[PDB]
């Protein structure tokens, strides 16, 4: 499917619900192609097929980033006449530009919904409310998230008591309860704030939109929710258990979310311009013998339950008779990840508390933490594992990178001689992935490495583990102060410190000896998209204006 015919039948493909499928296809996506797609992206953003779910991912990789474009797309789904849970989870790793207030992706949904809070019906209320269920930003953009969540409840309460035929069914009551229950239990402190206490008919810029809703709601009600509004929510449900079409609504939604200012362009890559268009003690031995039978069978997710069941029963039986009258299984760990691992997930955590190179680092941090609470766990596993890791680091990637990516001697005596020779042989100085052999990297206690990115990817994982472990050792050194302790501190500090600092050094080398810039042949670029974006926007207000 060449791009020429793709644009001709673009309109038809949208209707069928299969638009993005052919886009992530053949190469040759120029401005011509980009523009065409963008044209329809802001004219009538209505999706019914699977394109809805695959929209966010394409945008991420594309380059398109605008406050207007982004906003318009989201508003298409908001309006009402696959699961919703999936859609919201996709709203991550998508910064928003040209916006001094909301820069992330999670703030879009909190604005759209809130704005149109007054144009919802009871059946659909539950739909939006289902976002708390599992399948946002770390700390930032969190006050807004919980503030808007409480507003939903307000509407629900008011709407439910309107005098029930649909949600009062035998099956709908159970569904509703599931969601409600999740909220109740830990009322956030944000509810008990002056923002909600303002029942009597300078605010932050982030809550500009949220503040607007309150004013409206209160006026049409004839009330606030300051405290943890509960009981009433549950009491109502207890009685039933113990006994142009869609075109008009969009632009108003964007207008309400629109800021006072037109466009606050803090950062602009291209040149500043403007484009326009013209259209009694017997049971003890009966269960204690069932502890060593699983060792051979388990040498996984189901085998762990056998050991836990036997361990608790061995201790409880003897406890009753104790105050009435008056293990070396860790050795097997040296032959599962130290001699060739295969499919070892994070489950090793549970198989450590008395029960590639990244895998070994995990165990290092866990063993040191438990010991912090002399020959059998220090000079046998703790000190032996460090020798293997250090051996594969000095002569591993550290040195490898220094021989393949560094400048060769050939070039020294070929180019780096005179000035005139620099203007003809400059082409040979370039370094690419293609020119770099990944074979040496595949034997580092593992082809699992294809690109340069993979090499770098396997660096930050190992340094993270050791970095955390160093803090635990340091804390113990400054805590035991307030002659047997000297042996357990002098040797532990000199050995632990050698790996913490040395490992960090590797990162420095790995970050510098890598290809400069370069990208995969996909399509448009950030420079091209930026100009296209503005043209795609101004185009809409030319045709429809006449």
């Amino acid at each position: 499917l060449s791009p020429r015919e793709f644009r001709r039948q673009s309109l038809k493909l949208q209707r069928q619900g299969e638009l993005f499928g052919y886009f992530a296809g053949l190469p040759y996506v120029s401005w011509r192609s980009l523009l065409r797609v963008l044209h329809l992206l802001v004219t009538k953003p209505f999706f019914r097929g699977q394109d809805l779910l695959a929209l966010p991912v394409v945008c991420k990789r594309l380059g398109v980033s605008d406050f207007r474009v982004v906003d318009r797309l989201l508003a298409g789904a908001v309006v009402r006449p696959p699961p919703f849970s999936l859609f919201v989870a996709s709203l991550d790793d998508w910064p928003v530009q040209h916006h001094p207030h909301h820069m992330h992706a999670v703030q879009r949904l909190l604005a759209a919904i809130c704005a149109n809070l007054h144009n919802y019906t009871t059946p659909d209320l539950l739909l939006l409310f289902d976002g708390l269920t599992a399948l946002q930003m770390p700390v930032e953009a969190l006050e807004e998230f919980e503030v808007t969540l409480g507003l939903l409840l307000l509407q629900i309460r008011a709407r439910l008591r309107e005098g029930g035929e649909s949600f009062f069914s035998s099956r709908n009551v159970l569904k509703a309860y599931e969601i409600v229950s999740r909220v109740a239990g830990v009322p956030p402190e944000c509810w008990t704030s002056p923002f909600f206490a303002g029942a009597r008919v300078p605010t932050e810029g982030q809550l500009t939109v949220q503040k607007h809703a309150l004013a409206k709601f209160l006026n049409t009600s004839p009330f606030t929710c300051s405290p943890a509004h509960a009981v009433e929510d549950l009491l109502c449900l207890l009685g039933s258990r113990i006994l142009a079409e869609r075109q008009p609504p969009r632009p108003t939604a964007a207008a309400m979310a629109q800021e006072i200012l037109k466009r606050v362009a803090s950062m602009k890559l291209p040149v500043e311009k403007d484009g326009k268009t013209h259209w009694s003690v017997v049971e003890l031995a009966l269960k204690r013998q069932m502890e060593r039978m699983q060792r051979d069978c388990s040498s996984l997710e189901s085998a762990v339950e056998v050991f836990c069941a036997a361990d608790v029963g061995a201790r409880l039986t003897k406890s009753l008779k104790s105050s009435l009258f008056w293990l070396a299984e860790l050795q097997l760990r040296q032959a599962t990840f130290e001699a060739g691992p295969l499919l070892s997930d994070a489950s090793l955590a549970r198989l450590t508390a008395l029960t590639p190179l990244h895998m070994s680092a995990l165990y290092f941090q866990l063993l040191v933490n438990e010991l912090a609470t002399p020959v059998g766990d220090r000079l046998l596993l703790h000190a032996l594992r460090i020798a293997d890791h250090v051996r594969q680091r000095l002569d591993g990637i550290r040195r490898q990178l220094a021989r393949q990516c560094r400048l060769s001697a050939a070039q020294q005596e070929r180019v780096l001689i005179s000035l005139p020779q620099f203007q003809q042989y400059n082409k040979e100085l370039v370094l690419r992935d293609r020119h770099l052999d990944f074979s040496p990297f595949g034997k580092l206690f593992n082809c699992g490495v294809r690109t340069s990115r993979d090499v770098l990817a396997l660096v930050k994982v190992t340094n993270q583990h050791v970095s955390r472990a160093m803090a635990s050792v340091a804390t113990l050194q400054s805590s035991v102060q307030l002659n047997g302790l000297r042996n357990y501190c002098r040797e532990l500090q000199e050995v632990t410190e050698a790996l913490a600092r040395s490992s960090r050094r590797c990162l420095y080398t790995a970050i510098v000896q890598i290809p400069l810039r370069r990208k995969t042949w996909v399509g448009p670029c950030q420079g091209e998209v930026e100009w296209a974006t503005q043209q795609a926007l101004a185009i809409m207000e030319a045709d429809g204006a006449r």
């Binding site: 700390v139 020294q412 082409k427 804390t475 510098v512």
Partner: protein
């Protein structure tokens, strides 16, 4: 001589030679960009076929692994800037920061954080900034991590992180000062983490602070000192306050991390018992007088007597705190009260 001769010679010539290039008119200078786009013979041809000014300078910076070559690299940088051939980017800020580090020059690294936003577009990588904090701790200088933290925090460009707050706390408690002086400075950072957007620290935060809180003055004031305090009210009051902060924080963290004679242990589901260790402390009194001053724990400690929690036949915690107890606060505390008695 492989590491001395072949290293200095290669770098010396590269910068020296480059300088001479600039003397020629603009017609003979290197292109700014790699190449023309598709817009301007198969699509793979071109695009990436030429050497850029930026690419050449960064390529020669890989040779430094000593302090002497660090100065040399700076020389080249100036050339670009002065001739207007430098395009700030994410990459630029990342390699520069790291280059200093690789040359064993931590001193210079810190200066970058306070001079990047004046001449650069993008900030450095978050990873790099965190790594420099551990550098100072390894050398044994916990006093140099206070100024670096404040600059990062004050800056608006850089996104706030919760993890970053952990390092700071840990480094202050290890300062070589008095018991009361070290803890007082640490509490200031803790407080600061509750005002500006009410950040939520990890679950493994409040434990550390609490550990030393009720051990350095509380415990000390009832063991040897009152032989037959000045802030007793604050110590007790802050003890409980710390705990409270944890509760609120932990509840809000689970909603965003992974989108989750009288007793209340009958129908409370199966919570984590790890937290009950700190809350099981018995309140003696505000003063020395424990019998005539204050009149307001076994039932609480009955959940784990033998140092055996409901782990094997209970719930599972994600990213929990230290599982261990309080050796310096529990082991030596109850024995004394009993044996001596």
């Amino acid at each position: 001589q492989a590491r001395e001769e072949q290293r200095r010679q290669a770098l010396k010539s590269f910068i020296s030679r480059l300088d001479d290039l600039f003397n020629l008119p603009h017609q003979q200078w290197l292109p700014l960009h790699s190449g023309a786009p598709l817009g301007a013979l198969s699509p793979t041809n071109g695009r990436d076929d030429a050497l850029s000014a930026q690419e050449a300078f960064l390529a020669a910076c890989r040779l430094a692994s000593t302090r002497g070559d660090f100065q040399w690299c700076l020389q080249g940088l100036n050339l670009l800037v002065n001739f207007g051939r430098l395009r700030p980017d994410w990459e630029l800020s990342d390699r520069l920061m790291a280059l200093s580090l690789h040359c064993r020059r931590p001193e210079q690294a810190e200066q970058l954080l306070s001079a990047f936003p004046h001449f650069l577009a993008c900030p450095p990588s978050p990873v790099l900034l965190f790594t420099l904090i551990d550098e100072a701790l390894a050398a044994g200088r916990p006093q140099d991590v206070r100024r670096i933290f404040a600059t990062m925090r004050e800056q608006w460009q850089l996104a706030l992180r919760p993890a970053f707050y952990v390092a700071a706390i840990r480094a202050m408690l290890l300062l070589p000062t008095s018991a009361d002086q070290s803890l007082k400075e640490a509490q200031l950072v803790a407080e600061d983490a509750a005002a500006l957007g009410v950040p939520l620290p990890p679950v493994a935060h409040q434990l550390l602070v609490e550990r030393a809180l009720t051990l350095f003055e509380e415990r000390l004031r009832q063991a040897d000192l009152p032989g037959d305090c000045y802030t007793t009210e604050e110590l007790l009051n802050l003890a409980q306050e710390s705990h409270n902060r944890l509760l609120v924080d932990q509840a809000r963290d689970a909603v965003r991390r992974h989108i989750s004679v009288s007793e209340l242990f009958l129908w409370n589901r199966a919570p984590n018992a790890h937290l009950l260790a700190q809350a099981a402390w018995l309140q003696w009194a505000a003063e020395r007088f424990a019998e005539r001053h204050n009149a307001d724990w076994i039932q609480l400690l009955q959940q784990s007597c033998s140092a055996s929690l409901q782990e094997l036949a209970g719930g599972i915690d994600r990213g929990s705190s230290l599982h261990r107890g309080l050796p310096p606060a529990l082991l030596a505390a109850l024995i004394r009260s009993s044996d001596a008695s």
